[PDB]
Amino acid sequence: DAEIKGIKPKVIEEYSGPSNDSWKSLMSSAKDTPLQYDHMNRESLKKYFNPNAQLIEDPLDKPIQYRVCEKCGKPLALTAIVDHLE
Amino acid sequence: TAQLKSQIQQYLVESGNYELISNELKARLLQEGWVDKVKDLTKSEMNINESTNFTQILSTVEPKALEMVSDSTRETVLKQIREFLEEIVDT
Amino acid sequence: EETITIDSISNGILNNLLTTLIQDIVARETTQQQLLKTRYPDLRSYYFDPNGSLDINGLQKQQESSQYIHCENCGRDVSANRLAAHLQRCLSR
Amino acid sequence: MQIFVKTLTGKTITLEVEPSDTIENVKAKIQDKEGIPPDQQRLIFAGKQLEDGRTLSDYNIQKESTLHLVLRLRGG
Amino acid sequence: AMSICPHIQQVFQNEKSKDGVLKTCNAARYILNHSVPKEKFLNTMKCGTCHEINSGATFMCLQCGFCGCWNHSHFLSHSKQIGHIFGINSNNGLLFCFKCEDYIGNIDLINDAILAKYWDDVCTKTMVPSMERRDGLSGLINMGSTCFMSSILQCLIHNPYFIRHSMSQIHSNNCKVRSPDKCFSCALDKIVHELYGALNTSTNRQTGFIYLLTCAWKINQNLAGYSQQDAHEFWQFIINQIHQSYVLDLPNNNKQCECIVHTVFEGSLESSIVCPGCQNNSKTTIDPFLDLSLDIKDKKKLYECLDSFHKKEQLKDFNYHCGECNSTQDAIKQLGIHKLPSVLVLQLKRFEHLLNGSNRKLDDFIEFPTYLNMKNYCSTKEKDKENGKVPDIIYELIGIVSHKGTVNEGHYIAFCKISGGQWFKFNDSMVSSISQEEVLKEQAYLLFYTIRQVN
Ligand SMILES: [Zn+2]
Ligand SMILES: [Zn+2]
Ligand SMILES: [Zn+2]
Ligand SMILES: [Zn+2]
Ligand SMILES: [Zn+2]
Ligand SMILES: [Zn+2]
Ligand SMILES: [Zn+2]
Ligand SMILES: [Zn+2]
């Protein structure tokens, strides 16, 4: 409701033109980091869900992703197509 | 200067509080049905305008979606942001 | 040079969060619909009947007991609404 | 040992049982308390209905475990 | 006649340029899936020009390292100024053309870019879903009294975890029996084949269902469809059969089962026994669950029924000696959730037993939400700046089974929600569109909820 003057000096102490950073700077860390979810918090999943729980984030975001085998007509998940035989 | 906004946001992220705000906002909007209303609004605008062009569809959806935010969610989330802001700015 | 306040900056933070989310949601909708329309030029909506009578293809409930099933176990045609009864007498031995 | 049964109303009752006690026996004890015949009872633990002829130990039912009692809603 | 972005089409006329694009798309998306939240905010959602976080969508440049916002047109300026017309939205991995002012959503290679190395083979072996089968919508004809079976099967078939399991060929690859007339999981995969694809090569799309009926008759004739039965009993029966087929297909002190049932539907209850005087204690027992059965009498809302489930009770028939006060007490018992499942299945106890030995159905309406927050039912709290708090844990309603009739005779129907929010009603052979407002007025017997947000 009143007028702001600055940012507390202790916050700057330990927190803080065109940027020079690169989004690709994240690859190194990303290679070593387990799968993350946007809105399923990792620590809460450890506490409240089983360690072997299957998890699909936003399972109804889009329709089921699949293709159909030309030979046998089976619906195949995209990760199952290469290995699929008759 | 307008470096202030970016400064404040960086602090909110480093402190963990940006996540708390972002996550609580998302949860509120989801539970009150706003997320799905905005999806329905978007499908409707695509049908009315016979277009899937993101820029033109957004121009009609966004203003309306912002108006659709419940007063309850707006004031609860603002209250929370202001508490985290009153932590680290002098006024 | 408009005055900056906890209320103003907070409103800006909320506006940043809400417009991002809206933009995410809308991008997901428009990309999906673009795909469906490209994939399925003749795409039609599932039929909706306010009267609660027609199916998603705009058809009425088929007449049973008009339908039959060819039983792979014994080679006879069986009325579809009696297949379970038939299997009790057919799958045994 | 004591185990529990969360009854139709949600009220929990206690049974005195052995690990070797059969499901029939357990259902008889529930009938004595709740008045529901055994053939009308469905007793659920860990996602399974408990079957006559089996024992409590077959289902890993231990001291102070809770069984969930329901009836059947038939439809065609 | 829907068009494709000609700017990306132009790029794709050169194979190494195409590969460069897909490689970068794969990398950006990998980063987005493998970055902790603070890192993601600071390095993919921070505008390189104004330095704001979440100034609308933030775009990661396809050709350089720059990130640019939407609200202040800052990526748009990078495209005009550096000539980089392509950026990836850091919230969703989608590729924007700033010349079209549109996302590129209708190029299959880009959408499934992780398979770029094998794309040629993917197109020769496979086709996109047929329009009519894409959502797997199809009716299961009444074969006698089979509504208690088909209502459950529709909920299974429209369950995203089961869907993904079946289409990923997990069962097919390891099944030791490989006959849909004996193996329940084979029969289920056949139903999925029929509903989403095409069996080589009116009664349509009932083959898998007939196989299922045939499997059922061999294992339990009472639940195989001739007679009226309980949908909940059939649900538990089928998930047990899926589990049993997993165990059979194993080639082989390892307590948690790893099958699709036990990694999706299983949670645990914490049952506490506490002294009413000391209120400290407690003797805690952990019991697995695949579903929860809730009392409904004198209640009007699902949260009230969960509140009742979770309410403390003072036991009057339990022998209990407290060790902190060294005396006999009537113990306080409470059920809470120790671990939640990915898919939470709820049964409303729509029946009561009368003194004449008859039972009666409870037809009372119980309001149930489109999104269910389970935080108030979880036993263990996290730290919070005093007792602690459980964070929001929200599920999305995706399936309902309702019963019309009396305790001993009636009819079951299923309602399922698919992507986009449309609900369908599955009444034996008839599949129909229904509004959400109308679905929410149904007398729910079974409810199926999938995990959506965990704070
Ligand atoms: Zn094939
Ligand atoms: Zn036959
Ligand atoms: Zn373009
Ligand atoms: Zn910017
Ligand atoms: Zn660039
Ligand atoms: Zn099999
Ligand atoms: Zn299992
Ligand atoms: Zn005591």
Curated annotation (Swiss-Prot), chain A:
Transmembrane segments: none annotated. Belongs to the ataxin-7 family. It comes from the Eukaryota. Zn(2+) binds at C69, C72, H84. The gene is SGF73. The chain holds residues 5 to 95 of 657 of the full protein. It comes from Saccharomyces cerevisiae (strain ATCC 204508 / S288c). Present with 486 molecules/cell in log phase SD medium. It is found in: Nucleus; Cytoplasm. This is SAGA complex subunit SGF73. Component of the 1.8 MDa SAGA (Spt-Ada-Gcn5 acetyltransferase) complex, which is composed of 19 subunits TRA1, SPT7, TAF5, NGG1/ADA3, SGF73, SPT20/ADA5, SPT8, TAF12, TAF6, HFI1/ADA1, UBP8, GCN5, ADA2, SPT3, SGF29, TAF10, TAF9, SGF11 and SUS1. Component of the transcription coactivator SAGA complex. SAGA acts as a general cofactor required for essentially all RNA polymerase II transcription. At the promoters, SAGA is required for transcription pre-initiation complex (PIC) recruitment. It influences RNA polymerase II transcriptional activity through different activities such as TBP interaction (via core/TAF module) and promoter selectivity, interaction with transcription activators (via Tra1/SPT module), and chromatin modification through histone acetylation (via HAT module) and deubiquitination (via DUB module). Coiled coil: none annotated.
From Swiss-Prot, chain B:
Its main location: nucleus. Keywords: Activator, Chromatin regulator, Cytoplasm, Isopeptide bond, mRNA transport, Nucleus, Protein transport, Transcription, Transcription regulation, Translocation, Transport, Ubl conjugation. One of its GO terms (molecular function) is enzyme activator activity. One of its GO terms (cellular component) is transcription export complex 2. It holds the Pfam family EnY2. InterPro entries: TF_ENY2, TF_EnY2_sf. There is a cross-link at K64 (Glycyl lysine isopeptide (Lys-Gly) (interchain with G-Cter in ubiquitin)). Induction: The gene for SUS1 bears 2 introns, and its expression is highly regulated by splicing, translation and decay. The presence of the introns thereby play a key role for SUS1 function in yeast. GO terms for biological process: chromatin organization; mRNA export from nucleus; nuclear mRNA surveillance; poly(A)+ mRNA export from nucleus; positive regulation of transcription by RNA polymerase II; post-transcriptional tethering of RNA polymerase II gene DNA at nuclear periphery; protein transport; regulation of protein localization. Coiled coil: none annotated. It is found in: Nucleus, Nucleoplasm; Cytoplasm, P-body. Component of the 1.8 MDa SAGA (Spt-Ada-Gcn5 acetyltransferase) complex, which is composed of 19 subunits TRA1, SPT7, TAF5, NGG1/ADA3, SGF73, SPT20/ADA5, SPT8, TAF12, TAF6, HFI1/ADA1, UBP8, GCN5, ADA2, SPT3, SGF29, TAF10, TAF9, SGF11 and SUS1. PANTHER family: ENHANCER OF YELLOW 2 TRANSCRIPTION FACTOR. Belongs to the ENY2 family. This is SAGA complex subunit SUS1. It comes from Saccharomyces cerevisiae (strain ATCC 204508 / S288c) (Baker's yeast).
UniProtKB/Swiss-Prot annotation, chain C:
One of its GO terms (molecular function) is transcription coactivator activity. The keyword Cell inner membrane does not apply. The keyword Repeat does not apply. GO terms for biological process: chromatin organization; regulation of transcription by RNA polymerase II. Gene3D superfamilies: 1.10.287.210, Classic Zinc Finger. Changing G58A: Reduces deubiquitination activity of the SAGA DUB module. Present with 672 molecules/cell in log phase SD medium. This is SAGA complex subunit SGF11. It comes from Saccharomyces cerevisiae (strain ATCC 204508 / S288c) (Baker's yeast).
Swiss-Prot record, chain E:
Zn(2+) 6 binds at C275, C278, C322, C325. Pfam families: UCH, zf-UBP. Its EC number is 3.4.19.12. GO terms for molecular function: cysteine-type deubiquitinase activity; molecular adaptor activity; zinc ion binding. It catalyses: Thiol-dependent hydrolysis of ester, thioester, amide, peptide and isopeptide bonds formed by the C-terminal Gly of ubiquitin (a 76-residue protein attached to proteins as an intracellular targeting signal). Zn(2+) 3 binds at C61, C64, H78, H84. Changing C147S: Lowers histone H2B deubiquitination activity. GO terms for biological process: protein deubiquitination; proteolysis; regulation of transcription by RNA polymerase II; RNA splicing. Changing H403A: Lowers histone H2B deubiquitination activity. The active site is at C147, H411. Disulfide bonds: none annotated. Residues 138-452 form the USP domain. It is found in: Nucleus. A zinc finger (UBP-type) spans 23-123. The UBP-type zinc finger domain is required for the interaction with the SAGA complex. Present with 1030 molecules/cell in log phase SD medium. Belongs to the peptidase C19 family. UBP8 subfamily. This is Ubiquitin carboxyl-terminal hydrolase 8. It comes from Saccharomyces cerevisiae (strain ATCC 204508 / S288c). The lineage of its organism: Eukaryota, Fungi, Dikarya, Ascomycota, Saccharomycotina. The gene is UBP8.
